[PDB]
């Protein structure tokens, strides 16, 4: 589920707009939570090694006095107005900087109202955030909405959450330790090619061709199965996701 989500997250979707006053982007903002010490940071680095635009963490307008003009000066999300952006330790992040991500959740905009500048501007990419269950590292005796210390308004607007909890047992972690020592069996992994695995250079070419050559339309024929998929979570952000 996690690898399929990051695969279709970098596939992107469909970004359609109107002529003058409307825009919509095929995008999913993902969050990861659960048990620690697994591949989370690995992913958080791997995707930084895949996208051509992204920072491992918003920008800010400035009235430059030398030229008397409203310049912008940034990094982080602002730089990645394309591609992905990786944030780790979401629960330890402050509440004052959560208000800028509250606008980039579905609006993909920056609204600065300060001394010298009142400007709303473009800022859409997609966030990939890894979080932790407060001090709990997940508890079975508490609900999911209280265990991660994350506000409901800002989490219902999140497009995709991921319970990456371990729940340790037998005939699973044994294969985990065996696969981690199977490349320690030989000193060099030259034997990685005889399996069903595409190379990276073929994968990025196929992904770059599919992202710029396909504009899929969502027909009315898939209407009936969507209504009932919505009411099961209802018995609009989930529908948009």
């Amino acid at each position: 589920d996690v690898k399929k989500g990051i695969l279709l997250q970098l596939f992107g979707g469909t970004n359609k707009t109107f002529t003058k006053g409307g825009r919509y982007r095929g995008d999913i903002n993902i969050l990861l939570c659960g048990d620690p010490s697994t591949s989370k940071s690995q992913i958080l680095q791997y995707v930084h090694k895949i996208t051509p635009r992204g920072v491992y963490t918003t920008a800010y307008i400035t009235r430059d006095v030398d030229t008397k003009q409203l310049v912008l000066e940034s990094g982080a999300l602002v730089l990645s107005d394309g591609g992905v952006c990786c944030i780790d330790e979401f629960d330890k992040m402050s509440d004052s900087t959560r208000s800028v991500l509250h606008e980039v959740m579905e609006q993909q905009t920056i609204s600065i109202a300060k001394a010298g500048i009142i400007t709303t501007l473009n800022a859409r990419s997609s966030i990939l955030a890894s979080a932790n269950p407060i001090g709990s590292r997940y508890n079975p005796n508490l609900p999911v909405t209280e265990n991660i210390d994350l506000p409901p308004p800002l989490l219902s607007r999140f497009d995709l959450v991921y319970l990456v909890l371990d729940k340790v047992d037998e005939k699973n972690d044994r294969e985990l330790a065996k696969h981690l020592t199977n490349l320690y069996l030989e000193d060099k992994p030259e034997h990685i090619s005889q399996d069903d695995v595409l190379p990276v250079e073929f994968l990025t070419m196929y992904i770059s061709y599919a992202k710029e050559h396909i504009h899929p339309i969502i027909t009315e024929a898939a209407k009936t199965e969507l209504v009932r998929a919505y009411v099961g979570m209802r018995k609009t952000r989930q529908l948009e996701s």
Binding site: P36, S37, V168, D173, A177, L180
Partner: protein
């Protein structure tokens, strides 16, 4: 429980692998032997171990219980128990005394 702390993680397994690699690096070897992992596990278990600061008829009882766990019959005709006692190493006088003691104990 009461004296417990944490749980086993894959990062601890990776650290055990790294400590075995460091032990092989200290011996200047190109390979990792069985002597490093048994030292590293002893190291990580004695790192937390500071918080705590015959069988004369018992072997015959375990043999009788192994035969009682495979079929479960407390008969009076012993034909296989006497053969495994003869090939187990000891005598038959201790076997007869063990039979009399557990028949007195009614097993």
């Amino acid at each position: 429980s009461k004296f417990s702390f944490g749980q086993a993680t894959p990062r601890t397994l990776l650290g055990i692998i790294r400590l075995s690699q460091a032990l092989a690096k200290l011996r200047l070897a190109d390979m990792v032997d069985i002597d490093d992992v048994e030292e590293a596990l002893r190291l990580v278990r004695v790192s937390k171990e500071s918080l705590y600061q015959e069988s004369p008829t018992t072997k015959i009882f375990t043999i009788i219980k192994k035969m009682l766990q495979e079929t479960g019959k407390n008969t009076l005709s012993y034909e296989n128990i006497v053969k495994t006692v003869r090939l187990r190493g000891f005598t038959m006088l201790q076997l007869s005394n063990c039979i009399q003691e557990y028949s007195y104990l009614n097993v």
